[PDB]
Amino acid sequence: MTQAWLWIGVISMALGSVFFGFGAHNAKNERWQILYTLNFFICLIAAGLYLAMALGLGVNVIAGRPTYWVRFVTWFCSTPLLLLDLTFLGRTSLPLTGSLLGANAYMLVTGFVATVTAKPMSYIWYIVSCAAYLAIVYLLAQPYRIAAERKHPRSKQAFRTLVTVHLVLWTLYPIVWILSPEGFSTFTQGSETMFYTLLDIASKVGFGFLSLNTLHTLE
Amino acid sequence: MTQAWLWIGVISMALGSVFFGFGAHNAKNERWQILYTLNFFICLIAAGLYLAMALGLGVNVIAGRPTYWVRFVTWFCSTPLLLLDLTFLGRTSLPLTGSLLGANAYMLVTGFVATVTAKPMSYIWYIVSCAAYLAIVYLLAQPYRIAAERKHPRSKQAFRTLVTVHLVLWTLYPIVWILSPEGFSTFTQGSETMFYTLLDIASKVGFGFLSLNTLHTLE
Amino acid sequence: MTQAWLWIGVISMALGSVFFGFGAHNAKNERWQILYTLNFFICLIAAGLYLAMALGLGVNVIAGRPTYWVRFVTWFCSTPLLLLDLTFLGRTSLPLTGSLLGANAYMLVTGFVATVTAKPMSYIWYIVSCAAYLAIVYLLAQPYRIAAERKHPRSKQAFRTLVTVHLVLWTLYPIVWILSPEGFSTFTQGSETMFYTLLDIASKVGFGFLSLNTLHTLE
Ligand SMILES: *C/C=C(C)/C=C/C=C(C)/C=C/C1=C(C)CCCC1(C)C
Ligand SMILES: *C/C=C(C)/C=C/C=C(C)/C=C/C1=C(C)CCCC1(C)C
Ligand SMILES: *C/C=C(C)/C=C/C=C(C)/C=C/C1=C(C)CCCC1(C)C
Ligand SMILES: CCCCCCCC/C=C/CCCCCCCC(=O)O
Ligand SMILES: CCCCCCCC/C=C/CCCCCCCC(=O)O
Ligand SMILES: CCCCCCCC/C=C/CCCCCCCC(=O)O
Ligand SMILES: CCCCCCCC/C=C\CCCCCCCC(=O)O
Ligand SMILES: CCCCCCCC/C=C\CCCCCCCC(=O)O
Ligand SMILES: CCCCCCCC/C=C\CCCCCCCC(=O)O
Ligand SMILES: CCCCCCCC/C=C\CCCCCCCC(=O)O
Ligand SMILES: CCCCCCCC/C=C\CCCCCCCC(=O)O
Ligand SMILES: CCCCCCCC/C=C\CCCCCCCC(=O)O
Ligand SMILES: CCCCCCCC/C=C\CCCCCCCC(=O)O
Ligand SMILES: CCCCCCCC/C=C\CCCCCCCC(=O)O
Ligand SMILES: CCCCCCCC/C=C\CCCCCCCC(=O)O
Ligand SMILES: [Cl-]
Ligand SMILES: [Cl-]
Ligand SMILES: [Cl-]
Ligand SMILES: [Cl-]
Ligand SMILES: [Cl-]
Ligand SMILES: [Cl-]
Numbered sequence: 001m002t003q004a005w006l007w008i009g010v011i012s013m014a015l016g017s018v019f020f021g022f023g024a025h026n027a028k029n030e031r032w033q034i035l036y037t038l039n040f041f042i043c044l045i046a047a048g049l050y051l052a053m054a055l056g057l058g059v060n061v062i063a064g065r066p067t068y069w070v071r072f073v074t075w076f077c078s079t080p081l082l083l084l085d086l087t088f089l090g091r092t093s094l095p096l097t098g099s100l101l102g103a104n105a106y107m108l109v110t111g112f113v114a115t116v117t118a119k120p121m122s123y124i125w126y127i128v129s130c131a132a133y134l135a136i137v138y139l140l141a142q143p144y145r146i147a148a149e150r151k152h153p154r155s156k157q158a159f160r161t162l163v164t165v166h167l168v169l170w171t172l173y174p175i176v177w178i179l180s181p182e183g184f185s186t187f188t189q190g191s192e193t194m195f196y197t198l199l200d201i202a203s204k205v206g207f208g209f210l211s212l213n214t215l216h217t218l219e
Numbered sequence: 220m221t222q223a224w225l226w227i228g229v230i231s232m233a234l235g236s237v238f239f240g241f242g243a244h245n246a247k248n249e250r251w252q253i254l255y256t257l258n259f260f261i262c263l264i265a266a267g268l269y270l271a272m273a274l275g276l277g278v279n280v281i282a283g284r285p286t287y288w289v290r291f292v293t294w295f296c297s298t299p300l301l302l303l304d305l306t307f308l309g310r311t312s313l314p315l316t317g318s319l320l321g322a323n324a325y326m327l328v329t330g331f332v333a334t335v336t337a338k339p340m341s342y343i344w345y346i347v348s349c350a351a352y353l354a355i356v357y358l359l360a361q362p363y364r365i366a367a368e369r370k371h372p373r374s375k376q377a378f379r380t381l382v383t384v385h386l387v388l389w390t391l392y393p394i395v396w397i398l399s400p401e402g403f404s405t406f407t408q409g410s411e412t413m414f415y416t417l418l419d420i421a422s423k424v425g426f427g428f429l430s431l432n433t434l435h436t437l438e
Numbered sequence: 439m440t441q442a443w444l445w446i447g448v449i450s451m452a453l454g455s456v457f458f459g460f461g462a463h464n465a466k467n468e469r470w471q472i473l474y475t476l477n478f479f480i481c482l483i484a485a486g487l488y489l490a491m492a493l494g495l496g497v498n499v500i501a502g503r504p505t506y507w508v509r510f511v512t513w514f515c516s517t518p519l520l521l522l523d524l525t526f527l528g529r530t531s532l533p534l535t536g537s538l539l540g541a542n543a544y545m546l547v548t549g550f551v552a553t554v555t556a557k558p559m560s561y562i563w564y565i566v567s568c569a570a571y572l573a574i575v576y577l578l579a580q581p582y583r584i585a586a587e588r589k590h591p592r593s594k595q596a597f598r599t600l601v602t603v604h605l606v607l608w609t610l611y612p613i614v615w616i617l618s619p620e621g622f623s624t625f626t627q628g629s630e631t632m633f634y635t636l637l638d639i640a641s642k643v644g645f646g647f648l649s650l651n652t653l654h655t656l657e
Pocket of ligand 9: 130133137142174
C-alpha cells in the first residue's frame with residue numbers, strides 16, 4: 001500500500017514538474033515566468049522527496065514505527081516557495097514575507113523534533129509547532145489578505161479563495177500527524193503515507209494550478 | 220545544577236519572546252515593528268534551543284564530556300538575526316551586511332568542528348573560528364561603526380555603546396569555550412552551561428532591550 | 439598520495455584566500471571590493487573543506503570505498519558564490535539568478551544522494567543530478583550570456599571566455615564522478631581525490647583570477 005502511494009507521488013510530482021517547466025519556458029511575460037518557475041521547483045523538490053522515500057531512503061524507525069524524516073528536509077525548501085507564491089501574487093511587503101518564512105521555518109523544525117522524540121515529550125513540540133502554524137494562519141488570513149485586497153480591489157475573492165484553499169490544506173497536516181503513529185496512533189502507517197501524499201499533491205500540483213488561475217484573474 | 224540553568228534559559232527566553240512579540244503587534248511604525256520582530260525570533264529560536272537541551276536533546280558525548288552540539292544549530296539562525304539588529308539600526312549597506320553574515324556563519328561552523336573533534340586537533344579549528352570572529356570585531360568596530368556614525372552624527376555614542384556591549388558579550392563566548400571541558404577543562408561542565416546561559420540571556424534579551432533603547436535615541 | 443593532494447588543497451586554497459582578502463581590503467571601488475570579497479569566501483570555504491578532509495573528517499565509507507561526503511556540504515555554500523561571480527559581472531536579473539542558484543542546489547543535493555546510496559540505485563540520482571546540471575549549462579550558455587552581451591556589447595568575448603572556462607571545469611566533475619569508485623570504479627580512490635583537488639583549485643583560485651581579469655575588461 002505505502003510503496004504504491006510513494007510511487008503515485010513520484011509520477012504525479014514529476015509530471016507536475018514537466019507542465020510547470022513547459023509553462024516557464026513559454027511564458028509570455030516575466031510575471032508568468034516567475035510563477036511558473038516557482039511551482040516548477042516546488043514540484044521538483046517534491047518529486048525528489050518521493051523518489052527518495054520510494055527507494056527506502058530518509059527513514060529511521062522512531063518508537064518502533066517507520067518515520068520518514070526526509071519529509072521535513074524537503075518541506076523546509078518547498079513550503080517557503082509555496083509561501084512565495086502567495087507573496088508574489090499579492091505583492092506583499094518584504095517584512096511580512098520574512099515573518100511568514102520565519103514562522104514556517106520554525107513550525108517545520110519543531111515539528112521535526114516532535115516526530116523523532118519519545119512519545120510523552122513529543123506532544124510539547126507538537127503544541128509548539130502548532131502554535132507557530134497558528135501565527136501563519138493569522139498572518140495569511142489578516143495582514144496578508146487585507147494588504148492584497150487593498151492592492152487588487154477588483155479581485156478580492158481571488159485572494160480569498162487562494163488563502164482559504166491554502167489554509168484548509170495546510171491545516172490538514174497537523175490533523176493527520178496527531179492521529180497517525182507518531183501521535184495517538186489511531187490508524188496505520190500506510191494510511192498516514194497516503195494522507196500526506198494526497199495532501200502533498202493537492203498543496204503543490206493542485207495549488208500550483210490555482211495560483212496560475214489567480215494570476216490570470218489579476219490580469 | 221545544569222538542568223536548573225537550562226530551565227532558567229527556557230523561561231527567560233520564552234518570557235523574552237512574549238514581550239518582543241507584544242511590542243511587534245503594537246508597534247506604532249514599521250521601523251519599530253521590524254526591530255521588535257527581529258528580537259522576537261531571536262528569543263523564539265533561543266527558547267527552542269533551551270527547551271531541547273532541558274529535555275536531553277541535541278547532545279552526544281565527545282571525548283567523554285557532555286557536548287550540547289545543538290547550540291551551534293540554533294546559534295546559526297539566531298546570531299545572524301542579532302547582526303541584522305545592528306545593520307538595520309545603522310542602515311548598513313548590503314555588501315557589508317553580507318560580509319558580516321558570512322564571517323559569522325564561518326565562525327560558527329568551524330567552532331562546531333572544534334567542539335566535536337579530538338582533543339589535539341580541536342585547537343586548530345578554535346584558532347580558525349577565533350580568526351573569523353576577529354574579522355567580525357574589525358567589521359563592527361571600524362567600517363560598520365563609522366558608517367553608522369556618519370549617517371547619525373547626533374547619536375554617535377548610541378552606536379558606540381551598542382557595538383561595545385555587543386562585542387564585549389560575544390568576546391566572552393570563546394573565553395568560556397577555551398576554559399571549559401572542550402578546551403583546557405579548567406572548570407566543570409555545569410559551570411559551562413551556566414556561563415553560556417547567562418551569556419545567551421544577556422546577548423539576546425538584554426541586547427534586545429538595548430536595541431530598542433538605541434532606536435528611540437535615533438528617533 | 440591522497441593525503442598529499444588534500445594538503446595541496448589546504449595551502450593552495452589558503453594562499454588563494456590571502457590574495458583575495460588583500461585585494462578586498464585595497465579595492466579602489468565597491469565593484470572591485472564585492473568581487474574580491476566573493477572570491478575570498480569561495481577560497482575560505484574551500485580551505486576549510488580541505489583542512490577537514492586532510493584531518494580525516496567528514497568521511498564515512500559507503501559501499502566499501504572512502505567517501506568524503508563533506509565535499510557536498512562545502513560545495514553547497516561555495517558553488518552558489520561562484521555563480522554570484524557570474525551574475526554580478528553580468529548584472530544578471532534576480533529571477534535568473536534565483537533559477538541558477540536553485541538548479542545548483544538541486545544538482546548538489548541529488549548528487550549527494552547518488553554518492554551515499556547503494557550501487558545500482560546510485561545511477562538514478564546521478565542521472566537526476568546531471569539533468570539539473572544540464573539546466574545550468576543552458577541557463578549560463580543561452581539566457582545569461584545573451585543578457586550579459588546585450589549590456590556589455592563591446593566585451594562579448596569576455597563573457598564568452600568566462601562561461602566557457604566555467605562550464606568546461608564544471609563539466610569535468612560528473613566525468614570524474616562516473617568513472618571513480620562511486621561510479622564504474624575505473625580508477626583508484628587516490629586519483630579521484632587528485633582530480634577533484636585539481637578541479638577545485640582551477641574552478642576557485644584559477645576562476646577567481648579570471649573573474650578579476652573579466653572585470654578589468656569591463657572597466
Ligand atoms: C507541500 C508541503 C506542505 C504544504 C507541508 C505542510 C506541513 C505543515 C502545515 C506542517 C504541519 C505540522 C504542524 C502544524 C505541527 C506538527 C506536525 C506538522 C509538522 C505536520
Ligand atoms: C545568542 C548567541 C550568541 C551571541 C553566540 C555567540 C557565539 C560566539 C561569539 C562564538 C564563539 C566561538 C569562537 C570565537 C571560537 C570557537 C568557540 C566559539 C564557537 C564559542
Ligand atoms: C568549487 C566546486 C565546484 C565547481 C563543484 C562542482 C560540482 C559539480 C559541477 C557537480 C557535479 C555532479 C554532477 C553533475 C552529477 C552527480 C555528480 C556530481 C555531484 C559530481
Ligand atoms: C498527476 C497530475 C498530472 C499533472 C500534469 C497533467 C496536466 C496537464 C494539463 C494541460 C494544461 C493545458 C492548459 C494549461 C494552460 C495554462 C492555464 C492558465 O494559464 O491558467
Ligand atoms: C528573564 C527576563 C524576562 C523579560 C520579560 C519581563 C520584562 C518586561 C518588562 C516590561 C517593559 C515595559 C516597558 C517597555 C516599553 C518599550 C521600551 C522602549 O520603547 O524602549
Ligand atoms: C596555489 C596558488 C597560490 C595563489 C597565491 C599566489 C599568487 C599571488 C600573485 C600576485 C598577484 C599580483 C597582481 C594582482 C593584481 C590584480 C590583477 C587584476 O586586477 O586583474
Ligand atoms: C533545493 C533543495 C533540493 C532538494 C532536493 C530533494 C531531493 C533529495 C531529497 C532528500 C535526500 C535525502 C537523502 C537521504 C540519504 C540516505 C540516508 C538514509 O537512507 O536514511
Ligand atoms: C510561537 C511561534 C511564533 C512564530 C513566529 C511568528 C509570529 C509573528 C511575529 C510578528 C508578526 C509581525 C508581522 C510583520 C509585519 C507585517 C505587516 C507589514 O508588512 O507592515
Ligand atoms: C489540531 C489542528 C491544529 C491546527 C490549528 C489551525 C486551525 C485554525 C483554524 C481557523 C482559525 C480562525 C482563523 C480566522 C479566519 C479569519 C477571520 C476573518 O477574516 O473573518
Ligand atoms: C528558523 C530555525 C528555527 C529553529 C528552532 C529551534 C528549536 C529546535 C532546536 C533544535 C532541534 C534539535 C533536535 C534534536 C533531535 C534529537 C537528536 C538528539 O537527541 O541528539
Ligand atoms: C579567516 C576568516 C575570515 C572571515 C571572513 C571575513 C573577512 C572579511 C572579508 C572582506 C571584508 C570586506 C567588507 C565589505 C565591505 C564593507 C565596506 C562597504 O560597505 O563598502
Ligand atoms: C581568546 C579570545 C579570542 C577572541 C578575540 C577577540 C577580542 C578582540 C579584542 C579587541 C581588539 C581591539 C579592537 C579595536 C577596537 C577599535 C579601535 C578603535 O576604534 O579605537
Ligand atoms: C558559510 C559556510 C562555512 C563553511 C566552512 C567550511 C569548513 C568546515 C567544513 C566542514 C565541517 C564538517 C565537520 C565534520 C564533523 C566530523 C564528522 C566526521 O568526522 O565524519
Ligand atoms: C530536472 C532539474 C531541473 C533543475 C531546475 C532548473 C530548470 C530551470 C527552470 C526554469 C528556467 C527559468 C529561467 C528564469 C528566467 C530567466 C530569464 C529572465 O531573467 O527573464
Ligand atoms: C556525463 C557528463 C554529464 C554532463 C553533461 C554536460 C555537458 C554538456 C555539453 C554541452 C552541451 C551544448 C551546450 C550548448 C552551447 C551553447 C550553444 C551556442 O551558443 O552556440
Ligand atoms: Cl517537499
Ligand atoms: Cl485587481
Ligand atoms: Cl540560539
Ligand atoms: Cl541621528
Ligand atoms: Cl568548497
Ligand atoms: Cl562593455
